[PDB]
Design an enzyme around this catalytic site. Structure first.
Site, mmCIF file in Angstrom:
data_model
loop_
_atom_site.group_PDB
_atom_site.id
_atom_site.type_symbol
_atom_site.label_atom_id
_atom_site.label_comp_id
_atom_site.label_asym_id
_atom_site.label_seq_id
_atom_site.Cartn_x
_atom_site.Cartn_y
_atom_site.Cartn_z
ATOM 1 C CB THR H 1 -4.324 -3.248 -3.625
ATOM 2 O OG1 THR H 1 -3.851 -2.037 -2.710
ATOM 3 C CG2 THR H 1 -3.563 -4.452 -2.968
ATOM 4 C CB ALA H 49 -1.507 1.299 3.243
#
Lengths: 212, 212, 196, 240, 227, 268, 213, 201, 215
Positions: H1, H49
């Protein structure tokens, strides 16, 4: 029943209650008390018998001590009255209270709460027996803004002379508390027997002088 | 509810208007007694830092409403980080029940951007916003005065707003001066509770516009 | 790691804080204020574990503001410090402890200026000068060497500038700018940022 | 005039040995529109007649889903029928979750009766002002149950509850000797002719007022509404 | 006219010998006290008219809301004061948003009306949920008893029956939304008898295309230009 | 201002409501509200309490033609609020100082013609109010339940169903429910007034009369609600002595009563 | 110490299409190096448009499908309609995240049809993070299957290839190929391949033999 | 990420990649890491997430309840403070969230870094993720408050591209949003192979 | 409340209890007549110890009395847990009268029909107290309870003096019961308890018999 005065001056406040015994053998060691110290710098008097008096008085002391626990300062005097009057608003104690105190924001103070949860700041007031007689005698003779503790004790015994029922005002029948500031410290002094004798005899000397 | 609404009409007149850069909120301060201290009777209480409130009605029931709204301003400010909207704390006050309390309240102030707001709570919880309003004793006649004198050109400067509030109270409050209590805001600043000297100056400029 | 310093003079309290928020090797913010205005004459200065600082200090902030609104007058720095210490000690052994190190500065009308040291265990001490951080180790000796109780505020800003120059010289962390404030009888004054 | 000392609460026995609040709740079901339930050997059909607040309103529901195998129909206070549906749906979900099998219909009906006895005996709470008519299919075949506000439950060959449902019971008791050997369409037409006889002389069973709920062996519980009652009503005869 | 009470009415939890709770009966026929409010469901969307009854010209008309937004596809018009309705309105809003949070879809007008009616189980508010979902535009009346029903024209409030008898007559299934808005204004002007302007009536529509939409003062006065 | 004047004049002046303090009424009728005493502009509620305070006051016998001439004038107006409140005004104005009207053979006839006339108006609310005041004037016996009264009500009950117009629905041909259904609702509403005028007793004319209302349950709205509220209101008050109320009915009439479904929408 | 989990093996697979959704899984339930049974399919018909594939700890898989079936019935009671594929997706995200701190050790793949008739595949982690995919392999050999599906369904790392839409027959061929290739190298994968095809006509369900080792 | 966001004169540009891994296994190349809270706020997805998704969806729920109850859209400071107050209740329990609430309220464009540890700081530029350091490098060398719109797009795309190039856990496609005065727009979904052909040849 | 006055009506119907505060102690004599000879008088006791230094006695309703005997003894020992000091008599009367006031505020209960005479010795100083069913408490020199307490309270007011010893206070507490005994008391039908510096104790009937012989 019972009655007490509360008189604000420029150099202090007083409470001046009754000590009248209803029966010849009630001891009075227990009933002698009528002034209730609440913290380091604040006192009160009730309108009622000693049992519900202590129920109010210990709750006031407990509110003052949890304020001291939070802030390490004594509770300001209107704020303790506000706390108990918010307790008495949720219960709508058929007893009225008369507070003397000193705090750093507002100086010497004199409060009076009713059973309904209201309170008011006074410059002189009476709760209890012959209350209206005493405030009607007090509204005449209380000089606003220019009285001292000498004149305040004189007013206290002058009003209690002709509103107490006791038929001969003696030092055994009155508790006088005096809340002054002495070099950075509040002194709640319950004014003792010889001085109440000296102030009654000084009052009687003035009335017997004006009779001439 | 109807009991709580007849408690309001007995209470003192409170007038609020909302301007361009000011909200003014004026209450009939009332002669309470002679030996009464008039400091403890407030009737105009600041809620957050930007939300003020005048009530009409029972002062024991009002104080708990003021306290609960004054806690929830900080709780909203602690959960949402921004100040309360006057809409928000008005909707909270109208949501409060105890019985309902027994007050009506004019709630003035400014929101975060800088919009003046004026809101009015009923004891039945049915608040709504106003450009000018009166609650309390003689409230319908002061409101009838204000559907005549609330114009754009009568509120366009900051002083004519204060004088509109004073002229609205001077209908029912016949003491002509010293016996009214004002409070302005002037957005981003604070409450500014007007002095007895500043109120007397504004009353003088209102009286000078009456020989003309 | 996060630096606080207070210097308390005769009629003022000088306080400074570093202006840097960090995430493990990076500075995410370099204009970050660690001073939270309690009242018009009280500053709280709060460093410590992330998250706990804003939560505890804004709790104390809204409660001091609530006190002022309920009462029509402010808390003194002694009373605000003891309230802050009571909440930090009452949360100490609870399920949610705050790991925050505190400076409480403030000017009282009656008691003059006051500077309060408080660590994460909530032991409250009043001090003429105090500091948090690892830079406290480098600057409290400079303070001990050069503080006098009758220090002027210009001389106090000079002494502060000496301590922050020691941070620039000897300390390992990049602490370039410092928010600087004085609390007086006139309230809280923003001074210039001591930048490097 | 004749004011009664004993019909105050449900926890008061009359000196005649009766509880009047239970008895008065028993005629909260005759404040509801009629509903016929009847079973064959393979199916159990709930036919109900429903009414509208206006011509623009849309005909209050009376048959309600409880599970894939249990469907009920209501007469009386539809607020208490909602409490009973929520309870019964949750009991059906609980025993399809724990035992992975449908409820015996008689066990759910016993459990309803144990639920509704509690406000018939405890102070400050009224009996349930609804009577249910409960169709179900399980291992023992199809079932028609009546529960009443007296918390008494009935295992029925056929039953009608609701206002002026005596005439349906006069139909059903007359014709119950051939309900078991019916197919589906004839059982539905028996239920409709029982429901059609709870009508005045000018009224007729239309697609808007008739609601039909059928459960069976190889059929889950299905409620047949407005367009769906047209196969069931366009095979009847004119009113005799 | 005179007085007709018995021993079986105003007992708070007590059936009558005809299975009736007359304490609840009279507390439902005391919520006729609200101002009139007409919803009409059409195929082009549902419309909601309500009369506003402003007290003073010092008062904001946009501060007493008699049609609220439940969600972007559901509006609701109450009869009665707002403070009685506001827990039901807040419950409806929270239920739409919890249904969105769990299910990522818009809640139907029937399910919102059912979720409010569960919370109504009196509570003394008649509501009119008008909205658009996957079953087209839908209007739901929910009386204070907790009973809800789809209805394609409905008047609640002070003259509910006299306006409802007019809604029985102007309404048809092929009615456009502008005809419904004009008809609701005609019947509001009839049960009001006042001149009809943008300070004593609210109006809101929920169309299949756009969202919940309250009419502004300029958009409202175009409607009464030809009434 | 003059409304606040009549407010204080109601209880204080020796001859209340002179003949020119009577043309102030038809203007006060159309501005008074209908249902609630809630906050309406301080001029509607001011006119409501002024009307309530002014019916409640003695009249002279020469004055009861003049007030009733005022009332049937402003019951013929176009304001349905006015026709409602003249009918509440007549309702309080008769029973207070009622005989004065009963010592007038032309005033009782004028009042019964006025209430029967307003019982067939276009607004449902004034029809319900005219039924309430007919039922109340018939209860105190000011107004007698005639045999022509039954003939008129039963000949209104048999009007027709209007044969609902399939004209998509017209072009603009509505907003008034009907000219046909309003007559059936008037007749059913008058029969309901007659059976509600005897709350705690069944007389001999009631059982045959109450069978007529039973034939109007499935008669469409608004007639259905009037029948259901009328018969619920019947049997909530006739249960306390029902063991002797049922003896006036036949066994084929008690069976028709129990087969009535007069129950609200929160049942079934 | 007591361990509340065990890895029971199992590979699942869903692929979306223009008008279809193919959900497939092996039928071997394993534990350690043993095989509990060879007929334990990991696909579950939920509605007439939705099949969920569950792999991981089998006790959580059983409990979780029973909870999803109960929540389907609760939805259809309170809302008078069966759930959509996206609503079951969002609901299962909430169900799995409600057990954040003692998780369902379950790899969920929901394959079905959306409300315009097209295939929809939703891929979940054990704590409820999902997204809509075109295809997804989960479970025991997901790291094996997912590169070949990236190759052949995704048309990735290919040059000068035609991007035709995936038909049902060729996607069935791809499912059978990927599970033969996973039954070779994954030891937890084998014994059969249950394939559930969701079309507009309903859900039809096929089985294909795999290796028994 | 890698997720970045920066405020400039014409709004706040929000940028992220799309790679979610599980250890060294790349679970997905198509992750929507810029969470569209409502039409006026974006969040980002770094850490769990599921945590970012759930708690910003719960923030979306609370923001829409706010706008319904109050007839005005929520501010950015209020929404980020709601998110910080929600995730502060779960310190220690193991939440892994770090995000950037981006919007335009009536205080101007807004940007707040909120994480599960409880940092809630405003700021001009931020960069959250594993490859946040590599995005900070390029972004700090190219940033100004007075970028043009397409130049700010290029700055954020190229900074996320360089972060994907150096970080192993970053990759996929860059996803670029622009929060303007009237909501956000989604300006590009550029594959990193396409940006590699763009920036090198 | 009216139930408080009706609870005082049940006190004044009870047996006489007399308590006298001497200089060096406090007596608490009561009336204990058995309704017949069948009752073992040794069994149940009216004068009852609360601590080693506080005892009490009642008039009114015995079962109500045991409820506050049990709760006085609990309040006393939970004082002793906290302070490891015997409870002051006045503090204990505040606690017990708070308990006895609780049953007047709450609805669904009645007040106690019992009025307590709490005696004590703490800090070298005796105490006489009366707690009423209202929850009000009064400190006494001497008082009567129960049947004709008025006549006892004026019999005491005539024979009370402050320089009175404990033995003479036993003598004039037997006399106050004997002014209303109705029929020749003995050591088996009264019950005396004394506080002094040695603590509270209830006199043995052999020790009551000699006091009765001295009269």
């Amino acid at each position: 029943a019972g009655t007490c005065l509360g008189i604000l001056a420029n150099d202090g406040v007083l409470l001046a209650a009754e000590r009248r015994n209803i029966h010849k053998l009630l001891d009075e060691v227990f009933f002698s008390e009528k002034i209730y110290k609440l913290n380091e710098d604040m006192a009160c008097s009730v309108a009622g018998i000693t049992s519900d008096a202590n129920v109010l008085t210990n709750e006031l002391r407990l509110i003052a001590q949890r304020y001291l626990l939070q802030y390490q300062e004594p509770i300001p005097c209107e704020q303790l009255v506000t706390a108990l009057c918010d307790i008495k608003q949720a219960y709508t104690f058929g007893v009225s209270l008369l507070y003397i105190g000193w705090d750093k924001h507002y100086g010497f103070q004199l409060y009076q709460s009713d059973p309904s949860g209201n309170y008011g700041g006074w410059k002189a007031t009476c709760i209890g027996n012959n209350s209206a007689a005493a405030v009607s005698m007090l509204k005449q003779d209380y000089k606003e803004g220019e009285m001292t503790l000498k004149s305040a004790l004189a007013l206290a015994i002058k009003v209690l002379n002709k509103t107490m029922d006791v038929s001969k005002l003696s030092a055994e029948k009155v508790e006088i508390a005096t809340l002054t500031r002495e070099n950075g410290k509040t002194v709640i002094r319950v004014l003792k027997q010889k001085e109440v004798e000296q102030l009654i005899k000084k009052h009687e000397e003035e009335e017997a002088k004006a009779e001439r | 509810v109807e009991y709580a609404q007849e408690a309001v009409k007995k209470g003192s007149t409170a007038v609020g208007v909302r301007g361009r850069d000011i909200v003014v909120l004026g209450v009939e301060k009332k002669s309470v007694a002679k030996l009464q201290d008039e400091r403890t009777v407030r009737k105009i209480c600041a809620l957050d830092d930007n939300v003020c409130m005048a009530f009409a009605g029972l002062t024991a029931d009002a104080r708990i409403v003021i306290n609960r709204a004054r806690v929830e301003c900080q709780s909203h400010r602690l959960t949402v980080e921004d100040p309360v909207t006057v809409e928000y704390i008005t909707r909270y006050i109208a949501s409060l029940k105890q019985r309902p309390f027994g007050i009506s309240a004019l709630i003035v102030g400014f929101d975060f951007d800088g919009t003046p707001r004026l809101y009015q709570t009923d004891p039945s919880g049915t608040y709504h916003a106003w450009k000018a309003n009166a609650i309390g004793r003689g409230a319908k006649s002061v409101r009838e005065f204000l559907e005549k004198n609330y114009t754009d050109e009568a509120i366009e400067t900051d002083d004519l707003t204060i004088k509109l509030v004073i002229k609205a109270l001077l209908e029912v409050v016949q003491s002509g001066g010293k016996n009214i209590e004002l409070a302005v805001m002037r957005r981003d600043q604070s409450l500014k509770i007007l002095n007895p000297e500043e109120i007397e100056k504004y009353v003088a400029e209102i009286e000078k516009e009456k020989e003309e | 790691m996060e630096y606080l310093i207070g210097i308390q003079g005769p009629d003022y309290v000088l306080v400074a804080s570093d202006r840097v928020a960090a995430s493990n090797i990076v500075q995410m913010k370099d204009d970050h204020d660690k001073m939270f205005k309690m009242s018009e004459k009280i500053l709280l200065l709060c460093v410590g574990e992330a998250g706990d600082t804003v939560q505890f200090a804004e709790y104390i902030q809204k409660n001091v503001q609530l006190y002022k609104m309920r009462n029509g007058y402010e808390l003194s720095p002694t009373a605000a410090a003891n309230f802050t210490r009571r909440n930090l000690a009452d949360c100490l052994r609870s399920r949610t402890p705050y790991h925050v190190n505190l400076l409480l500065a403030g000017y009282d009308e009656h008691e003059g200026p006051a500077l309060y040291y408080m660590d994460y265990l909530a032991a409250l001490a009043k001090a003429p000068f105090a500091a948090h951080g690892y830079g406290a180790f480098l600057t409290l000796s400079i303070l001990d060497r050069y503080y006098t109780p009758t220090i002027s505020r210009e001389r106090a800003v000079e002494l502060l500038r000496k301590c922050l120059e020691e941070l620039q010289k000897r300390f390992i962390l990049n602490l370039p700018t410092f928010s600087v404030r004085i609390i007086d009888k006139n309230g809280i004054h923003d001074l210039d940022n001591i930048s490097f | 005039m004749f004011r009664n000392q004993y019909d105050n609460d449900v926890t008061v026995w009359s000196p005649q040995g009766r509880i009047h609040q239970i008895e008065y709740a028993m005629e909260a079901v005759k404040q509801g529109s009629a509903t016929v339930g009847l079973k064959s050997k393979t199916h159990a059909v709930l036919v109900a007649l429903k009414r509208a607040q206006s011509e623009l309103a849309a005909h209050q529901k009376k048959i309600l889903h409880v599970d894939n195998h249990i469907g009920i129909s209501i007469a009386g206070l539809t607020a208490d029928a909602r409490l009973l549906c929520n309870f019964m749906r949750q009991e059906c979900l609980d025993s399809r979750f724990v035992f992975d099998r449908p409820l015996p219909v008689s066990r759910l009906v016993s459990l309803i009766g144990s639920k509704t006895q509690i406000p018939t005996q405890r102070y400050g709470r009224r009996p349930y002002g609804v009577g249910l008519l409960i169709a179900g299919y399980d291992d023992m075949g199809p079932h028609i149950f009546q529960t009443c506000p007296s918390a008494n439950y009935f295992d029925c060959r056929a039953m009608s509850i609701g206002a002026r449902s005596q005439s349906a019971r006069t139909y059903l008791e007359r014709h119950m000797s051939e309900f078991m050997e019916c197919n589906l369409n004839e059982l539905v037409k028996h239920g409709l002719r029982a429901l059609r006889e709870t009508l005045p002389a000018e009224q007729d069973l239309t697609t808007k007022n008739v609601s039909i709920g059928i459960v069976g062996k190889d059929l889950e519980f299905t409620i047949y509404d407005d367009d769906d009652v047209s196969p069931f009503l366009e095979g009847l005869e004119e009113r005799p | 006219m005179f007085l007709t009470r018995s021993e079986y009415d105003r007992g708070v939890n007590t059936f009558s010998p005809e299975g009736r709770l007359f304490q609840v009966e009279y507390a439902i026929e005391a919520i006729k006290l609200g101002s009139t409010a007409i919803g009409i469901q059409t195929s082009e969307g549902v419309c909601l008219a309500v009369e506003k009854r402003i007290t003073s010209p010092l008062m904001e008309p946009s501060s007493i809301e008699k049609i609220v937004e439940i969600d972007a596809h559901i509006g609701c018009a109450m009869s009665g004061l707002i403070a009685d309705a506001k827990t039901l309105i807040d419950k409806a809003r929270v239920e739409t948003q919890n249904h969105w949070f769990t299910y990522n879809e818009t809640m139907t007008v029937e399910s919102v009306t059912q979720a409010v009616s569960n919370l109504a189980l009196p509570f003394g508010v008649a509501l009119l949920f008008g909205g658009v979902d996957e079953k087209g535009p839908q209007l739901f009346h929910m009386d204070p008893s907790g009973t809800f029903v789809q209805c394609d024209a409905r008047a609640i409030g002070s003259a509910s029956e006299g306006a409802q008898s007019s809604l029985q007559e102007v309404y048809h299934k092929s009615m456009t939304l502008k005809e419904a808005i004009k008809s609701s204004l005609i019947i509001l002007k009839q049960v009001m008898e006042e001149k009809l302007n943008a300070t004593n009536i609210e109006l809101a529509t929920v169309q299949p295309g756009q969202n919940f939409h309250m009419f502004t003062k300029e958009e409202l006065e175009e409607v009464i230009k030809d009434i | 201002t003059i409304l606040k004047w009549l407010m204080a004049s109601a209880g204080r002046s020796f001859s209340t409501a002179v003949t020119e303090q009577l043309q102030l009424l038809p203007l006060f009728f159309k501005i008074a509200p209908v249902e609630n005493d809630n906050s309406y502009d301080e001029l509607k509620r001011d006119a409501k309490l002024c009307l309530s305070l002014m019916s409640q006051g003695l009249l002279y016998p020469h004055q009861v033609p003049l007030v009733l001439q005022v009332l049937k004038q402003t019951a013929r107006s176009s304001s349905w609020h006015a026709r409602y409140t003249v009918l509440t005004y007549l309702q309080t104005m008769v029973f207070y100082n009622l005989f004065i009207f009963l010592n007038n053979e032309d005033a009782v006839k004028d009042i019964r013609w006025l209430v029967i006339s307003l019982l067939e108006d276009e607004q449902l609310e004034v029809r319900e109010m005219a039924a309430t005041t007919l039922s109340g004037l018939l209860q105190c016996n000011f107004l007698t339940m005639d045999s022509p009264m039954q003939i008129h009500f039963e000949q209104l009950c048999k009007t027709k169903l209007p044969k609902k117009r399939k004209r998509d629905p017209g072009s603009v041909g509505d907003t008034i429910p009907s000219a046909e259904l309003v007559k059936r609702h008037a007749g059913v509403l008058g029969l309901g007034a007659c059976v509600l005028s005897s709350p705690y007793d069944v007389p001999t004319w009631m059982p045959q009369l109450l069978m007529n209302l039973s034939a109007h349950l499935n008669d469409p709205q608004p007639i259905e609600m009037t029948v259901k509220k009328t018969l619920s209101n019947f049997r909530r008050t006739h249960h306390d002595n029902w063991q002797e109320h049922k003896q006036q009915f036949t066994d084929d009439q008690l069976l028709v009563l129990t087969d009535l479904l007069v129950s609200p929408c929160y049942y079934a | 110490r007591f361990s509340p989990y065990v890895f029971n093996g199992g590979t699942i697979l869903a692929i979306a299409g223009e008008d279809f959704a193919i959900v497939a899984s092996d039928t071997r339930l394993s534990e350690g190096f043993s095989i509990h049974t060879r007929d334990s399919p990991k696909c579950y018909k939920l509605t007439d448009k939705t099949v969920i594939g569950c792999s991981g700890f089998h006790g959580d898989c059983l409990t979780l499908t029973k909870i999803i079936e109960a929540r389907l019935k609760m939805y259809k009671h309170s809302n008078n309609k069966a759930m959509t594929t996206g609503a079951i997706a969002a609901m299962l995200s909430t169900i799995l995240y409600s057990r954040r701190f003692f998780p369902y050790y379950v790899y969920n793949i929901i394959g079905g049809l959306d409300e315009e008739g097209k295939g929809a595949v939703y891929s979940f982690d054990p704590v409820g993070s999902y997204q809509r995919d075109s295809f997804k392999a989960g479970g025991s050999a997901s790291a094996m299957l997912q590169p070949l599906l990236d190759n052949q369904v995704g048309f990735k790392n290919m040059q000068n290839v035609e991007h035709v839409p995936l038909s049902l027959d060729r996607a069935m061929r791809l499912v059978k190929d990927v599970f033969i290739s996973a039954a070779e190298r994954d030891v937890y994968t084998g014994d059969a391949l249950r394939i559930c095809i969701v079309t507009k006509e309903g859900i039809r369900e096929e089985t294909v033999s795999l290796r028994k080792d | 990420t890698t997720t970045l966001a920066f405020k400039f004169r014409h709004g706040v540009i929000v940028a992220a990649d799309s790679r979610a891994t599980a250890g060294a296994y790349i679970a997905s190349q198509t992750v929507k890491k810029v969470i569209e809270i409502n039409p006026y706020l974006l969040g980002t997805m770094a850490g769990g997430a599921a945590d970012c998704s759930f708690w910003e969806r719960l923030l979306a729920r609370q923001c829409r309840i706010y706008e319904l109850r109050n007839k005005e859209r929520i501010s950015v400071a209020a929404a980020s403070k709601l998110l910080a107050n929600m995730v502060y209740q779960y310190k220690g329990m193991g939440l892994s969230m770090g995000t950037m609430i981006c919007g335009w309220d009536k205080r101007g464009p807004g940007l707040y870094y909120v994480d599960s540890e409880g940092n809630r700081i405003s700021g001009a530029t931020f960069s959250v993720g594993s490859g946040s350091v590599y995005a900070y490098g390029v972004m700090d060398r190219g940033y100004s408050y007075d970028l043009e719109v397409e130049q700010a797009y290029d700055l954020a795309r190229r900074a996320i591209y360089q972060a994907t190039y150096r970080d192993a856990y970053s990759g996929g496609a860059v996803n670029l949003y622009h929060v303007r005065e009237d909501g956000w727009i989604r300006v590009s979904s550029d594959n990193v192979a396409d940006l590699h052909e763009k920036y090198s040849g | 409340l009216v139930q408080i006055e009706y609870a005082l009506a049940a006190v004044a119907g009870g047996a006489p209890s007399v308590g006298i505060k001497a200089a060096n102690g406090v007596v608490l004599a009561t009336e204990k007549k058995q309704k017949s000879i069948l009752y073992d008088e040794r069994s149940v006791h009216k004068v009852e110890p609360i601590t080693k230094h506080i005892g009490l006695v009642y008039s009114g309703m015995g079962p109500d009395y045991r409820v506050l005997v049990h709760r006085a003894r609990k309040l006393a020992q939970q004082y002793y847990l906290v302070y490891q000091e015997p409870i002051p008599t006045a503090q204990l009367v505040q606690r017990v009268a708070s308990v006895m006031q609780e049953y007047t505020q709450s609805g669904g209960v009645r007040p106690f029909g019992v009025s307590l005479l709490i005696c004590g010795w703490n800090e070298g100083r005796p105490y006489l107290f009366q707690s009423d069913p209202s929850g009000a408490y009064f400190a006494w020199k001497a008082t009567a309870m129960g049947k004709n307490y008025v006549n006892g309270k004026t019999f005491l007011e005539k024979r009370y003096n402050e320089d009175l010893e404990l033995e003479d206070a036993i003598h004039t507490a037997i006399l106050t019961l004997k002014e209303s005994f109705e029929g020749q008391m003995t050591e088996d039908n009264i019950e005396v308890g004394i506080c002094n510096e040695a603590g509270f104790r209830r006199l043995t009937p052999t020790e009551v018999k000699d006091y009765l012989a001295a009269i």
